[PDB]
Amino acid sequence: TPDVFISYRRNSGSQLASLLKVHLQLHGFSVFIDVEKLEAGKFEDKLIQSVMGARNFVLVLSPGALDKCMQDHDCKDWVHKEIVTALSCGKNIVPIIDGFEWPEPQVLPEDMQAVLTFNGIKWSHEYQEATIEKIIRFLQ
Amino acid sequence: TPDVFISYRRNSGSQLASLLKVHLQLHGFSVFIDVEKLEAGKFEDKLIQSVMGARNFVLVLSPGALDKCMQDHDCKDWVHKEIVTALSCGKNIVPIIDGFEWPEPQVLPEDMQAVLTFNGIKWSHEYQEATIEKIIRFLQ
Numbered sequence: 001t002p003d004v005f006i007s008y009r010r011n012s013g014s015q016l017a018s019l020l021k022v023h024l025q026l027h028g029f030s031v032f033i034d035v036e037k038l039e040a041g042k043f044e045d046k047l048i049q050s051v052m053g054a055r056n057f058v059l060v061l062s063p064g065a066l067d068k069c070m071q072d073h074d075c076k077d078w079v080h081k082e083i084v085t086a087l088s089c090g091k092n093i094v095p096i097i098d099g100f101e102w103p104e105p106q107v108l109p110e111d112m113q114a115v116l117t118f119n120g121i122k123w124s125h126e127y128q129e130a131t132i133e134k135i136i137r138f139l140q
Numbered sequence: 141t142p143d144v145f146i147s148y149r150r151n152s153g154s155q156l157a158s159l160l161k162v163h164l165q166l167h168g169f170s171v172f173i174d175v176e177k178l179e180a181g182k183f184e185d186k187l188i189q190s191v192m193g194a195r196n197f198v199l200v201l202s203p204g205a206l207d208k209c210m211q212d213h214d215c216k217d218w219v220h221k222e223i224v225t226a227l228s229c230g231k232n233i234v235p236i237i238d239g240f241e242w243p244e245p246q247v248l249p250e251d252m253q254a255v256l257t258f259n260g261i262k263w264s265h266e267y268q269e270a271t272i273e274k275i276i277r278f279l280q
């Protein structure tokens with residue numbers, strides 16, 4: 001059962017999300033990212049269970065990463081579903097900020113507005129190792 | 141003296157470039173990427189000498205990566221400068237395709253059109269380890 005769940009928006013954060021996976025594994029954390037760990041069966045159940053099972057929830061805020069969450073009030077967007085599950089289970093949420101612009105809370109669905117109240121880490125392209133060490137301090 | 145020089149477009153390839161660096165280092169290559177190895181002094185000479193110093197030239201073709209090379213006949217664009225140096229020195233050039241569209245040769249300045257004649261490696265989000273293993277087979 002993975003220590004860390006990495007949630008990300010494919011069209012804009014795939015590369016950073018995989019970069020985060022490599023570094024965290026090199027530092028001894030078990031990591032769930034879909035392309036390495038989402039295997040057979042109905043994926044809706046497996047994904048939700050993977051979030052529920054992970055102590056740490058690493059949220060890759062690339063540019064526009066929460067845009068498809070906006071007005072998703074049936075909760076059909078997958079980042080939205082993953083965040084609400086992490087919030088509902090009281091996980092240690094660690095937002096990683098990479099060119100993300102902070103939205104107004106009211107533009108996000110009520111069941112995920114609390115994600116903006118967690119302290120985020122700025123991804124520094126020039127000081128990546130320092131960025132990684134800070135992330136590890138945030139993790140449990 | 142690094143074996144591998146990674147050339148890349150910051151606004152679209154920085155994450156993949158850094159991910160390539162970490163994997164190549166794990167497999168024992170000395171890698172030059174600017175944010176880790178470009179240090180003090182006039183950077184023009186330092187960059188060109190660093191291309192000259194590496195046997196392998198890894199070119200990250202993220203979407204639109206060559207767009208600023210087009211009509212750069214003054215040769216002010218840094219990706220343009222790095223490619224021309226690599227071609228001129230007869231380097232082992234290894235393009236990494238990440239959503240790149242192949243342009244018609246004639247839209248590119250004459251001194252870099254030969255970059256399109258090198259066999260490129262498709263970057264696979266779902267089979268990243270296999271992509272890396274292929275890149276290593278291409279290196280010298």
Ligand SMILES: C[C@@H](c1cc[n+]([C@@H]2O[C@H](COP(=O)(O)OP(=O)(O)OC[C@H]3O[C@@H](n4cnc5c(N)ncnc54)[C@H](O)[C@@H]3O)[C@@H](O)[C@H]2O)cc1)N(C)C(=O)N[C@@H]1COCC1(F)F
Nearest residue numbers: 006007008009010011034035036038039043078079082266
């Ligand atoms: C449904 C999709 C999925 C979506 C979202 N997340 C989580 O949500 C975040 C990313 O959200 P987001 O950027 O908005 O992604 P979408 O725009 O929804 O991608 C939708 C695209 O998925 C493809 N597609 C649709 N139906 C299936 C299917 N039945 N089987 C396989 N592929 C499918 C298709 O190409 C479509 O365009 C992130 O945190 C992640 O953990 C995980 C998995 N899926 C099962 C896979 O990709 N499975 C791949 C095969 O095994 C490993 C794998 F996961 F890589």
Ligand SMILES: C[C@@H](c1cc[n+]([C@@H]2O[C@H](COP(=O)(O)OP(=O)(O)OC[C@H]3O[C@@H](n4cnc5c(N)ncnc54)[C@H](O)[C@@H]3O)[C@@H](O)[C@H]2O)cc1)N(C)C(=O)N[C@@H]1COCC1(F)F
Nearest residue numbers: 146147148149150151174175176178179183187218219222
């Ligand atoms: C000039 C620039 C540079 C440009 C290009 N490449 C090579 O060209 C590829 C990327 O092409 P590309 O996406 O088109 O880059 P540009 O948009 O041209 O960058 C322009 C931006 O650079 C900043 N900027 C400008 N003047 C200086 C300066 N005197 N000192 C520090 N920063 C400067 C500024 O922010 C501007 O916006 C890639 O393969 C790489 O090897 C290497 C270095 N430079 C020296 C640095 O960034 N130095 C940083 C300090 O050490 C680590 C470092 F290397 F990161």
